[PDB]
Design a binder for this molecule. Sequence first.
Ligand SMILES: Nc1nc2c(ncn2[C@H]2C[C@H](O)[C@@H](COP(=O)(O)NP(=O)(O)OP(=O)(O)O)O2)c(=O)[nH]1
Ligand SMILES: [Mg+2]
Ligand SMILES: [Mg+2]
Length: 430
Amino acid sequence: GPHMATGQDRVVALVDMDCFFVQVEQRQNPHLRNKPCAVVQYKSWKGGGIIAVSYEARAFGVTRSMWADDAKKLCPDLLLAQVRESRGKANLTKYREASVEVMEIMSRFAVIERASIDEAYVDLTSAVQERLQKLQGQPISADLLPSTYIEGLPQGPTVQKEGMRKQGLFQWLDSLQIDNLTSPDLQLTVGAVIVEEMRAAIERETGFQCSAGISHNKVLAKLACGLNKPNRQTLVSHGSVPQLFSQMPIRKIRSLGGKLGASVIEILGIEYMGELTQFTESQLQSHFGEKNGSWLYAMCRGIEHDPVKPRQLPKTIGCSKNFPGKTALATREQVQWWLLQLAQELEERLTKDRNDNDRVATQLVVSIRVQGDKRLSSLRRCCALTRYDAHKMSHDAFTVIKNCNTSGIQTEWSPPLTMLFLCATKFSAS
DNA sequence: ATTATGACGCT
DNA sequence: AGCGTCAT
Ligand SMILES: Nc1nc2c(ncn2[C@H]2C[C@H](O)[C@@H](COP(=O)(O)NP(=O)(O)OP(=O)(O)O)O2)c(=O)[nH]1
Ligand SMILES: [Mg+2]
Ligand SMILES: [Mg+2]
């Protein structure tokens, strides 16, 4: 009771751009604004593969990983934008630049952990404390939280969504104002005020809309963020966790969407995150290992300690291309030519990186997939990255993998390669 | 023919 | 160092 930690020590937010690549294309081409739209890679095969979908298009059932030709059957008026293609591969530069715009703004408010091209975690604990002092005990107005949902509210004794949002917010604030709500709850509330400000700054300065989650840890903040997309933010308090998790499928939680999550469900015979609470830590550790067990025991109670790492830049810089089915690379000249295309793009990105961020990568990782192999990578080899030189990088990459070629003939390559992937890693100060 | 390419744990 | 998981 007295001595039990409740995991309410921090205020953490997760900010994620709405249909990010689509908004980047919509900003540049106003014709696409406010319309069912998607972003695809390539064009020849089935119209290209969709990787981003505007909310207008999602209403027709359009989804990521759908072929554009197929999406067009669901949504005849779907507008498409295709990622830039350079050297015969996808070139995501425009979205990486857009990403920097957003990350730079977020970094003004607080320490952030870049989690993906379109999202960052924010540790707002200190910022909250500072605002609480400036506030001097002033009541927090609903006006300061124009886009915030309080998960779990309203409750008790609204037909329209904005009506529900407001009633929930009023219930929440009226309880904070009375003083019934905990200090952790006040802290989350101030975090939400700051996040409103962060999101307003992002929209004003970039034109991009986003959603956000505010809670006491990264897992809950990420979960919260997705609850009310698009263009809204959600506050998930410690107290909201029991009801929220009671019907929350285990696969919903970050890190549990794959094999581990499936084994939890299968071994324990449960469906929802809340059901995890009936097991002892030791039980969970025995089934899922010491680290995962401990993590699950705390998580199902809404507690997680993974820190927001101070990292605004990616740890690696890489590029890859698949060669599916019949296009699989089958000659030595072919492998080398594509290795050079990958290396050239990478050299460009690495040079820019060195200039902007005062660092140099020192290791080059080469990954390939062989035909018939389900795995992401069939083989990984590394060499020293001593020069930002595409010819040298591609030549070195070839040197470390050329062994894989079973065929006696130099010209032929077997087994055929279904992916090439060059990753620059092990950065150091420059 | 689910592509491009990230972080990160285990050994 | 080299492979497996989770992600979208
Ligand atoms: N190349 C590539 N890019 C991808 C892929 N999947 C996603 N992206 C790119 C395109 C995405 O726009 C972007 C951000 O990823 P999300 O935040 O997961 N989805 P979004 O922001 O689109 O919508 P919302 O958050 O409102 O649901 O990453 C992929 O499989 N391949
Ligand atoms: Mg997003
Ligand atoms: Mg995202």
